[PDB]
Amino acid sequence: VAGKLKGELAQFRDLAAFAQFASDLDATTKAQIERGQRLQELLKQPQYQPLPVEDQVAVLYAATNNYLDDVPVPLITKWRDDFLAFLRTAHPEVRKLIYDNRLDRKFPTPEVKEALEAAIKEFKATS
Amino acid sequence: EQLANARRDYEAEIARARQEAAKIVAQAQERAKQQEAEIIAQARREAERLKEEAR
Amino acid sequence: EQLANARRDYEAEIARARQEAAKIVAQAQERAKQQEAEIIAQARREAERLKEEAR
DSSP states (O other): OOHHHHHHHHHHHHHTTGGGSSSOSOHHHHHHHHHHHHHHHHHOOOTTOOOOHHHHHHHHHHHHTTSSSSSOGGGHHHHHHHHHHHHHHTOHHHHHHHHHTSSSSSOOOHHHHHHHHHHHHHHHHHO | OHHHHHHHHHHHHHHHHHHHHHHHHHHHHHHHHHHHHHHHHHHHHHHHHHHHHHO | OHHHHHHHHHHHHHHHHHHHHHHHHHHHHHHHHHHHHHHHHHHHHHHHHHHHHHO
């Protein structure tokens, strides 16, 4: 879940030069800039708030696979905190499945994929 | 025909959206109950951890 | 006008459903927060009792 995050942040840094222009950016460039800003806001983390690895991979999966574009930039930190609270309360078994299934060579297996996606959909609906 | 069909489909889609909103309301109530239960369970686990730490 | 009224009614229903869900979630979350604060206070009292036992 982090290789593609690194790629997207790289394109954001590459396109940071064009960000000054207004309306001169095509749909692809504007979408890439929005994704980059969203990822950057996601990385912003308060002090004394560690995230277990399962929460990290779940959050990055949510952020990178187009489940976060609708969320506006100023509220992404609260979105992440709310989503982590929802996971810790709603579906702890999802986090356990992530934790015991993180070592596997191909992490996005069908069961973990569908469970995590269902959790994200339920959270977004409840929002 | 346009007027009649528009009104009829308006009512029918209103009923369909009412069913969807009923599902949404049921989901909201069930999620509130499940979240209350999960908060209670997590608080109990935290209190047990605090008591074990105290011991 | 009827075709637009269909969307109007659907939007009103959606808004009602969302508002109901949000209010229910907020009330449940407030209740859960109060319960968690009570459990935390009980844990602190238990820790003070453990400290008294150690003393």
